[PDB]
Design a protein around this motif. Sequence first.
Motif, PDB file in Angstrom:
ATOM      1  N   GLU B  22       0.828  -1.194   0.000  1.00  0.00           N
ATOM      2  CA  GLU B  22       0.000   0.000   0.000  1.00  0.00           C
ATOM      3  C   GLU B  22       0.868   1.252   0.000  1.00  0.00           C
ATOM      4  O   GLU B  22       1.959   1.276   0.573  1.00  0.00           O
ATOM      5  N   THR B  44      -7.989   1.392  -4.222  1.00  0.00           N
ATOM      6  CA  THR B  44      -7.638   0.306  -3.316  1.00  0.00           C
ATOM      7  C   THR B  44      -6.153   0.225  -2.995  1.00  0.00           C
ATOM      8  O   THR B  44      -5.769  -0.573  -2.133  1.00  0.00           O
ATOM      9  N   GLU B  47      -3.699   5.744  -0.462  1.00  0.00           N
ATOM     10  CA  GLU B  47      -4.375   6.581   0.516  1.00  0.00           C
ATOM     11  C   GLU B  47      -3.584   7.864   0.699  1.00  0.00           C
ATOM     12  O   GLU B  47      -2.366   7.857   0.690  1.00  0.00           O
TER      13      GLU B  47
HETATM   14 MG   LIG Z   1      -6.912   1.216   1.547  1.00  0.00          MG
END
Ligand SMILES: [Mg+2]
Lengths: 117, 280, 198
Positions: B22, B44, B47
């Motif tokens: 991520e 997805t 962030e």
């Molecule tokens: Mg996420």
Amino acid sequence: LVTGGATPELEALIAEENALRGGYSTPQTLANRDRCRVAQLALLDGPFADLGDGGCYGDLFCKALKTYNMLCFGIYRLRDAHLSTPSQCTKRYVITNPPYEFELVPTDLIFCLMQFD
Amino acid sequence: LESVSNFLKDFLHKDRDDVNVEIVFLHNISPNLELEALFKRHFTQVEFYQGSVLNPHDLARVKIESADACLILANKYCADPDAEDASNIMRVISIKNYHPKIRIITQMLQYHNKAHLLNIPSWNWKEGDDAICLAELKLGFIAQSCLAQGLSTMLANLFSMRSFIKIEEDTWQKYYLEGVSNEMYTEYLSSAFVGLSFPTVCELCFVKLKLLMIAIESRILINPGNHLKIQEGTLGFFIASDAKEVKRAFFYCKACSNVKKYDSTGMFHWCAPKEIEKVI
Amino acid sequence: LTRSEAAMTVLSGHVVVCIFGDVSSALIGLRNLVMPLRASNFHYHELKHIVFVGSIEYLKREWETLHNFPKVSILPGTPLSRADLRAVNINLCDMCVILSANQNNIDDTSLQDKECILASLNIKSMQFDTTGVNIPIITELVNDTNVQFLDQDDDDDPDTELYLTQPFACGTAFAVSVLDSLMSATYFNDNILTLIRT
Ligand SMILES: [Mg+2]
Ligand SMILES: [Ca+2]
Ligand SMILES: [Ca+2]
């Protein structure tokens, strides 16, 4: 590969004194010269030149590696060399890691790493 | 917008293997509508959180104490390179102060500022702290083009993730793109190749597995001689179309004299300090 | 001095002063720092030597008020140069003092103390045949919030007051903002300003 070696010793020396300092010759200094140097070599003369028109890149890669401990990651091919008509343009371009089946023309240059003597 | 767009194109490219890392962005400016749309196209995997890297509260918010690394992009086109280097140095100082054991990858415009930065007590280049100096690497690439013209292009194309592109026209661009489709990778290689010479495993890997080796893990050795034997448990610096191809290098088992001439390390030529008028 | 004579001149228990001067920078007024060290209730054998490291232009823009004092020296280098700080015997001093003149010219509130912080970290990241963390060091900061970068073992919080911060509680950092109570103290007790001054 890009700065021609910068081992942790040199990175400490340039951090403490911020200049290259000259050293007397030692056996370890003469051993530290053995590392490969990047090169171009011609395809029109020398032991590789029997790979003339219609040779295979795999044949060249194999014979260079087997006999001179030398291997090629690309061809610096003339821009207009794929055309039928002759041209006065001398500009070339980088072909990277071509197939074994890839076809040579006699006006070529080869990128490779070569041994130290 | 362009900095994030370029970073996400290279980080999330389909030629890498199935990584699920991520990406968390920390910036003190609210993103404009086009950046918010770019983050929604990556909903997805990306962030964003609004904060200052100099704030320990924000650093705790982005969970930097458990992050795998911290990447610090730099403004290459800034008006004041010294000011940009100072700001990046302050950011590195703040991140290291909050968490000394965080891997930091940063871009440094100059080399003297890089020397200034590497004196930080928590700056550990062995642990994985990499200061990518732009001026240094570009001048090194230009110098390698002086040893072999075109080598700066050759090196630059090995990092950018690129898919194969093919067209019906017989033009120099087709061949060029076919060459551009390959990147440099790194992975561990089969016990079936331990005990052989480096040239031998290279001529074996070349078209049977379809893989080319530039180097192996006396650690980092650029194009080893015929006298070097492959250690058990080593990694090869492959050039390949992608990461899923180099898996073969693992998944195979017979499937057929007081003169100071040099520097103190013996790696560069040297001479006594010449006056400027001597060389003019 | 220069590199040669600085390195061969043995120094210990001295004061090392690190100045980030400039040709356009303001005058710090180093007289007021030198004079208390030079006071006469110390014997002459007890006078700690003083050496200033910094831009030669700034030193020749202030030396006009420091020529009547003994045991002083200038080294025309950079306070961030590891070679200079090694040549000055930084590990044997009784104090290192870090001051910056470029504090008002720029308006960023981020780079005001960058040079001082970098110099402090460079001195604390030095290896001596002991580490550089045990060296006696004081630095002057313009922003009180920048004190969190001086130490790494301490816990940092912007809400925490400067007097409560660990580097200040240890006497490692000093800021001009702690002197604001002297207005109130002076008013209520007129002798306090002279007791402090003396
Ligand atoms: Mg996420
Ligand atoms: Ca690719
Ligand atoms: Ca701290």
